[PDB]
């Protein structure tokens, strides 16, 4: 009765060899739990990777429709539903995720209630319905008992640090996570291991440890086939080369862009950094979003205007942005641009202070180079990057 069961029953009467093929793909010892899954409603595999690996290799193009149907039909009190919630969150399938959260909050199993409550906190935080301070308050209010939700509560805040351009807390949060403590759920452990890897990759990218950054991103790319992890992995590798190597940076951004086909949210990340890359290297720029009101997007239009030596038009557009709320990292770039336009040392010092505040050891190079060009002590500038 669940779409995937119907699909597999249909394909099985046409082809008898599919039992053995699905058994090895699902990591099963023998074809028996497969028979059970197809016949007795309610049967769920011991490991959720069983259903994902069957869906991925047999119905590559119907994953979302099939998975959405599987998940909405699951008993919310079970390990399966708990894994489906992780699956949905990891892929950013928000319709699947919000409906599981709704029904997991209400039910009477303590573990599923906990998973519901923590993922809701993560969702409310990504959407700006709450801020870090309420998140932390809600996490403690929960008195979490599982190792997993303890770990996921640390990652939750790391994701917020990452999009608010506040990178200092993140290595500190990372160090509080130990994955071998998660015992029952093998799938959840795998998913987390991969989440951590891109997280780690970002941490190193901001610490300017560029070799380790690419190590962890590649580690993620090698072991996953979930679109979300591919996207951010390639995003990260490309940013790691933004200042060293134009071609390597372009190529990873294009690889990532191909993996993002038909998901406008993921595409936007690449368009933005391709915009920046081409502005920074002063190459022709097919990527600028000229009618976005987003601070990052207006910054790109200004940076382009600077390269076309239109310093007057650039200054007016930049004053318009002083009106707008920006995070510390965005102020970093803001003051860098003010400097290129105005040739004032002051603008560059501010830029360094903001990149220090947000602890972006990567971007700090830009205003530092500029200060060295205007006669500031080079030895001291070296000590600032230490």
């Amino acid at each position: 009765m669940e779409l995937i069961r119907i699909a597999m029953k249909k394909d099985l009467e046409n082809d008898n060899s599919l039992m053995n093929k699905w058994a090895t793909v699902a990591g099963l010892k023998n074809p028996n739990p497969l028979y059970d899954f197809l016949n007795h409603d309610g049967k769920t595999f011991n490991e959720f990777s069983s259903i994902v690996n069957i869906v991925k290799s047999q119905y590559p193009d119907r994953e979302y429709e099939l998975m959405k149907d599987y998940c909405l039909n699951l008993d919310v009190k079970t390990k399966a539903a708990r894994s489906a919630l992780e699956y949905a969150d990891a892929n950013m399938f928000f319709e699947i995720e919000d409906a599981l959260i709704d029904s997991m909050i209400s039910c009477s199993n303590m573990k599923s209630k906990e998973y519901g409550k923590v993922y809701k906190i993560h969702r409310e935080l990504s959407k700006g319905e709450i801020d870090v301070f309420e998140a932390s308050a809600n996490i403690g209010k929960q008195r979490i008992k599982t190792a997993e939700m303890n770990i996921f509560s640390k990652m939750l805040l790391m994701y917020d640090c990452l999009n608010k351009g506040n990178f200092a807390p993140m290595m500190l949060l990372f160090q509080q996570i130990d994955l071998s403590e998660i015992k029952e759920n093998r799938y959840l452990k795998n998913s987390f291991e991969t989440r951590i890897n891109v997280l780690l990759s970002n941490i190193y990218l901001n610490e300017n440890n560029l070799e380790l950054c690419r190590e962890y991103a590649q580690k993620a790319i090698s072991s996953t086939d979930t679109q979300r992890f591919l996207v951010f992995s390639y995003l990260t590798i490309g940013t790691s080369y933004i200042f060293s190597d134009f071609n390597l940076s372009k190529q990873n951004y294009l690889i990532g862009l191909k993996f993002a086909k038909g998901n406008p949210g993921f595409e936007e990340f690449f368009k933005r950094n391709l915009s920046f890359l081409n502005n920074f290297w002063n190459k022709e720029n097919e990527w600028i979003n000229y009618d976005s009101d987003a601070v990052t997007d207006m910054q790109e239009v200004i940076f382009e205007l600077i390269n076309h030596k239109e310093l007057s038009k650039a200054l007016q557009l930049l004053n318009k942005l002083e009106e707008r709320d920006q995070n510390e990292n965005e102020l970093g770039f803001h003051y860098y641009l003010k400097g290129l336009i105005t040739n004032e040392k002051e603008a560059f010092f501010k830029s360094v202070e903001y990149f220090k505040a947000s602890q972006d050891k990567l971007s700090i190079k830009m205003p530092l180079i500029q200060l060295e060009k205007m006669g500031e002590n080079p030895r001291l500038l070296k000590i600032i990057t230490m």
Binding site: M158, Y159, L162, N163, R195, V198, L199, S201, N202, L205, N206, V231, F232, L235, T236, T239, I242, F269, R272, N273, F276, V295, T296, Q299, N329, E330, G332, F333, L362, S363
Partner: peptide, 6 residues
């Protein structure tokens, strides 16, 4: 700006 995501 540079954008990031994990």
């Amino acid at each position: 700006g540079i954008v990031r995501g994990a």
